[PDB]
Amino acid sequence: EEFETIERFMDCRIGRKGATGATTTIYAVEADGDPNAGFEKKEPGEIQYLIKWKGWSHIHNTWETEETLKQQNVRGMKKLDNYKKKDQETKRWLKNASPEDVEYYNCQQELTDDLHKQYQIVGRIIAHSNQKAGYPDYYCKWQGLPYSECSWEDGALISKKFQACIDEYFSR
Amino acid sequence: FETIERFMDCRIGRKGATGATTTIYAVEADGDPNAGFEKEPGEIQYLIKWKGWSHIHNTWETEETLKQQNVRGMKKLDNYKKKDQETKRWLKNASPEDVEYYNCQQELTDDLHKQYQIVGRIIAHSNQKSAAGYPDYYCKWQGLPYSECSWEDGALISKKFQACIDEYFSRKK
Amino acid sequence: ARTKQ
Amino acid sequence: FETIERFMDCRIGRKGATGATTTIYAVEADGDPNAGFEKNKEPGEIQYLIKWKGWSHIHNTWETEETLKQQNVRGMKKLDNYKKKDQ
């Protein structure tokens, strides 16, 4: 009686079959490995979308298939038809875009993408919970985003990549 | 029936300073209904980014106008408020340092958001023209990926981005 | 087209 | 004259947004006639991006069964085979 709902489509790639979901979170990749790591270096492809989930911070995005989504009962899938239509709509414009335009497109998407990557890195932990199952949860200010997007995140992790921010925090 | 996609900002301004008359294009063409706000006693108004409308079409709205319009997404007004409260409580007593950050790191986003409202580049136009003779323009917004491009009214755009327009047709040779 | 009219 | 060399794409677009007026040089010249479309305008047609034999891609256009129909292009067989997708 739960079900996440997709909020924003972040990116799409052609990737290894099964290299979608939980194990594609930046911190899983980091922890364990990247299921899409070797890809097309021959083997079957699968157009996958990078999802931003309602309720979770970008640090939790995952790659997904038009199916895995259905096979999971996520809401917002009406957004998937909007995206698809748009991507083709542009992949199209590409083959004919003058080099002067293709360059702009590349610079902008380059930037845009770096932006979308900050969102995943703690900028400053501003608060903390004092209910430890062994660690405190931390309230995080994400780089590139408003405080309106601070989100409680599991301690334990945070520490795995952002100790400096929590060691900082820390006045005293 | 419209949908609240995102809460961009929060303010307090003249009562009535909400809706269409509060867009930046309307404001530029007619002045700010919130004009030189302040003696004035005010209302809590939210800057809202709508579903299927570009940031150039955002508008300030009060919890009331929202309900009056039957817009969908009201759930969002509660979270936002609950979140806004959570922030304050947590920043009641923070170093002045904590506070500087917050104000800098918030002026950054404030300024960033404004960009979405300006056409960084027009990349195609319509074969059909208004009765006025304006075609519509597929606009690429400053700060947002091409997945965010959109078709905007010809007349609307021309009022403020005639360059991009001029420089779009100029690029044909 | 379509603005806030 | 006029055979079909290959169906390049497919789409739902404004009725009429087909033919000469859909070449890249014509779109760039006088705007895209599919501009702004989206399923709620009542034109809704299935349109195929049909690259032509004897013409390079810049000349490819968007046609419809009815449009291919009345021009009398050869290669319709291609259409049948293109209308070939299952789940």
Side-chain angles (χ1 to χ4, degrees), chain A residues 5-17:
Chain A
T5 155
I6 84 94
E7 161 185 279
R8 228 232 293 205
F9 275 114
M10 301 310 282
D11 192 355
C12 75
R13 70 193 189 183
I14 287 77
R16 183 166 291 139
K17 290 204 315 181

Side-chain angles (χ1 to χ4, degrees), chain B residues 86-129:
Chain B
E86 170 131 46
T87 287
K88 319 218 177 317
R89 192 172 182 73
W90 287 157
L91 255 17
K92 240 194 296 161
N93 214 60
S95 325
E97 330 158 15
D98 282 318
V99 170
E100 185 67 49
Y101 193 80
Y102 169 95
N103 279 308
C104 314
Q105 258 304 301
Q106 198 71 359
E107 226 188 281
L108 249 145
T109 48
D110 274 317
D111 291 308
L112 212 317
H113 296 161
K114 300 178 308 173
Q115 305 218 299
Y116 308 163
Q117 277 169 176
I118 112 79
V119 162
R121 180 161 224 154
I122 52 310
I123 69 171
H125 72 287
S126 79
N127 161 274
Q128 189 179 182
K129 292 165 291 151

